[PDB]
């Protein structure tokens, strides 16, 4: 319908064929870097304080 | 290129039929009424035309001369014109090729969008249906505010009233009934889409407009019709949209579909009615209102009616706004719409400010209808919410024991509860989950001037966790044990976790 | 139908107008005028972006 009421459909084509092969990027987890503290809490609760209490 | 191949298209079908058509002669025009000389055939209240293919309202029959009502402006009408009678009481198109559009009081369209395909044409002033048609309001109109939902219910085919002051909330409780039927009406049932008439009468067309665009956000244009006769339409469409509005809506519920038909204001169509009978020098009365003034509106909202299911089972409820004067409920219009009506709805501006929005008076507001009209799980829970601010309202002018103190405490917990917002109306499953947990007990440990963001943050849980439990009480309408025992475990999990 | 003399009267003039359309005939100063005022009002309305292609984002991650 969009490109059924412009004078140029051309233009609007190219729009649309632009739009089907441009997508769009995602975050990742570098942010998430938070990682690393579980891995020191396997010593407190289960090494260090589970062992100690 | 094809625009203009579009206009001929226009002109290639035309109107080539002159007939030999009874005429008459305006003796005089002025102030927007013409008296017409001939026209010995006119009926009562016919639709007669002008010689600018304006029209008109033939309303007093003399001896002498017909009183003729122009509706439209009148700069164009001058003395020796021609009067031609189209030979038919005013009547208007209906139909389902109506909705979405805006509409003048005549039924033309008044949004561009081209012309209306209504196939068929009603008249405005057709007498309310028997007394042996209707049937006792049985549904529940499902209006979205929960102080409305809970505590002055509205059936289908009822006619509440909402009355009050100047900018106390009116219009917003009729626009959050307008969007809410927007779940229903994107369903599959059509035994509960309800399509919507709005009719705004003397009201400034930028307000209109607002309306209207607040209504295309919301998607709800899709089953709206808005029926506009705003300030600068002469007298005479005033007078006569909310008899448009009212067909539009009676060919709804004469073809056993659901209407729902708000009249904004009728304290302005009155005021309309008064300045035509005035300049037709019919003798004034009482705030030189007509004598006919209580009949106006009574044989108006007399066609919202509740069909049996002999008749379609069709409904068409009815919302009248009426205006006080600094809460003078006792004025003339608002008393006569007052003992015209069902319930009411009382919104104070002494409540807008406290800080109560919307103001609903819960204390006067009443639904005559009451017990019926109410969905079996907010019968249960409202009833409690309805007894427990009944008592917390006698004791709450003052601010000691446990019981009476705990008793203030739920009485302010609720108040906070009934609280909300705009444009944003509840799913009745969600007001009684809210409602549920505020009455239960369980908010008399928080604070009360935290509790709304309790009630947005629990609806934003239980509309994403426990979908299924609000489909169990949509579907099974009622608080079940075992939905009780869940909403139980939901509320008190909950609220430690907050 | 081949009666109406106002009826094929329009049709024609409607045929005259088609055929003279190279510009719009009659148009005066403002037509011009118009066209440029409500054009710079939508542009202003809609935005000032790169009113041809598609233009780029270039978020930023959290
Ligand atoms: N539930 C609500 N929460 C917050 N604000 C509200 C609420 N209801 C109404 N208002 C405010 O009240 C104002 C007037 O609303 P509304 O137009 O509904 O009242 P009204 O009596 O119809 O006004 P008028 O009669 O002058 O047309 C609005 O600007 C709106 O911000
Ligand atoms: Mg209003």
Redesign the interface.
Known sequence: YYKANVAKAGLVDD?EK??NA?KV?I??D??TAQVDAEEKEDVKSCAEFLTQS | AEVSSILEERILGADTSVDLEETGRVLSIGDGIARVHGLRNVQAEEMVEFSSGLKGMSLNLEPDNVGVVVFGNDKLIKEGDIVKRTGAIVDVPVGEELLGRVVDALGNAIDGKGPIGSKARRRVGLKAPGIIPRISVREPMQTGIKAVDSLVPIGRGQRELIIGDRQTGKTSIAIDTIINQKRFNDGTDEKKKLYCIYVAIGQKRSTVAQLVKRLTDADAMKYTIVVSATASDAAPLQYLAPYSGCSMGEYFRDNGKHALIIYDDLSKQAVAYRQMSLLLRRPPGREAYPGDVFYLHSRLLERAAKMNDAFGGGSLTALPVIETQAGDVSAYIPTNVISITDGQIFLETELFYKGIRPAINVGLSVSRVGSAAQTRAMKQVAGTMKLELAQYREVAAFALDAATQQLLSRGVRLTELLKQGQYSPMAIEEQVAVIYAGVRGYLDKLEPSKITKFENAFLSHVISQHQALLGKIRTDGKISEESDAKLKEIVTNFLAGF | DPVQKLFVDKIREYRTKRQTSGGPVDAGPEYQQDLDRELFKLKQMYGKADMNTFPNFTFEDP
């Open positions: 729009f632009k739009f441009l990027p975050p990742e570098k942010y």
